Design a binder for this molecule. Sequence first.
Ligand SMILES: CC(=O)N[C@@H]1[C@@H](O)[C@H](O[C@@H]2O[C@H](CO)[C@H](O)[C@H](O[C@]3(C(=O)O)C[C@H](O)[C@@H](NC(C)=O)[C@H]([C@H](O)[C@H](O)CO)O3)[C@H]2O)[C@@H](CO)O[C@H]1O
Ligand SMILES: [Ca+2]
Ligand SMILES: [Ca+2]
Ligand SMILES: [Ca+2]
Ligand SMILES: [Ca+2]
Ligand SMILES: [Ca+2]
Ligand SMILES: [Ca+2]
Ligand SMILES: [Ca+2]
Lengths: 193, 201
Amino acid sequence: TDTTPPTITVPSDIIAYRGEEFEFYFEITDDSGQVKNIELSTFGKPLGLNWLEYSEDNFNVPGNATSDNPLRVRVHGTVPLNEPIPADKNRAQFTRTIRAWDAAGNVSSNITFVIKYRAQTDKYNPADPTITYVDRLSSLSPSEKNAVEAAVRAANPQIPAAARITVSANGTVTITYPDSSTDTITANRVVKD
Amino acid sequence: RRATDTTPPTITVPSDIIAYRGEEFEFYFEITDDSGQVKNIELSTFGKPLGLNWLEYSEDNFNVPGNATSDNPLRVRVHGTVPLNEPIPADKNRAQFTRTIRAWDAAGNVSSNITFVIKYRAQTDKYNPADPTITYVDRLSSLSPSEKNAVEAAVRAANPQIPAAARITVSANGTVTITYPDSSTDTITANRVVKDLASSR
Ligand SMILES: CC(=O)N[C@@H]1[C@@H](O)[C@H](O[C@@H]2O[C@H](CO)[C@H](O)[C@H](O[C@]3(C(=O)O)C[C@H](O)[C@@H](NC(C)=O)[C@H]([C@H](O)[C@H](O)CO)O3)[C@H]2O)[C@@H](CO)O[C@H]1O
Ligand SMILES: [Ca+2]
Ligand SMILES: [Ca+2]
Ligand SMILES: [Ca+2]
Ligand SMILES: [Ca+2]
Ligand SMILES: [Ca+2]
Ligand SMILES: [Ca+2]
Ligand SMILES: [Ca+2]
């Protein structure tokens, strides 16, 4: 007779960037080999994360949750592009809980997991462009600005196509990501006389 | 038959030479001589130095018999690029250089200097941007980075004739600036560039 609830392993470093789909897995095991269902909540209260979704593939099937082959629950979602980021990054997160139960109805305690979220510039780190030679380092021409932007773009296919690259009069590059966070490339990585 | 050539060459000048800063241009002088041969030319400022180091011409076929007949005149190709930064005064018509040309035949006769005028203008005078296909945006007063990219691409697509070296910028409200290589500009007002997505869907 099964009187023992499932056990749940959560990922330690769920880090999501605004506006960009994330995914992670829960792993659930039960001594019976079978997990019936799970529930995501805020310590038992409503989850309150309508942009998060998880798959219920293979729920409630014998053998779906053994020590060797745990039930691997795919969770995905997109933190809103305009999600405010608190000044203290330790509060830029969502703390939530998961519980799970077996076919006998033994329910686990609430297990904590944390979704940290960050501005897109915390993900992206622009690579060096090929240097653009300019006539005046203090007053780039329109052609030179075009060349700088093209070189930054060619070096950074990994940056969203939707980010906008601007170039100031002295060759300083600003990259503005879709979520309005930014990176800067100092002119000395960009232009030479 | 007169014993000697005493008649200098005759030069025809182009009447409407118009150059845009930063863009190569060319024009032709046509020269004939009663002997059929023109030895060389001089471009000057009424006999003083030309003072236009960006003006060039080929001496191909100079001083060859038969190079300068009525049926087959000497065609002198003059070409160059007015500097990107050449100053254009408040009166755009003052943006011109009046210079002189003369030519020698092979008998020592040199024509008297005649004038020609190189007018030069800003590039925005040459280029007239077509309006882009409308970009639909969420906030007319604050375009997103992808909306500014989209506007720029639309302006670029609607204007293949504009130079690739022109830089297209987009303001917060979708006002477009096209800055040509010589830093002259054209503007497209926001109401011809962007429209609110919700109002229009
Ligand atoms: C008799 C004789 O040989 N005298 C010439 C004298 O005529 C000449 O003065 C120039 O004359 C021409 C007309 O034939 C023009 O009026 C010149 O003015 C301009 C020009 O068209 O070249 C006006 C123009 O606005 C100016 N451009 C700019 C950008 O400012 C130019 C410019 O000052 C010079 O051409 C660049 O050197 O001038 C007028 O000056 C003079 C020399 O030009 O030579 C005498 O012997
Ligand atoms: Ca159990
Ligand atoms: Ca399995
Ligand atoms: Ca960054
Ligand atoms: Ca980082
Ligand atoms: Ca651009
Ligand atoms: Ca002659
Ligand atoms: Ca124009």
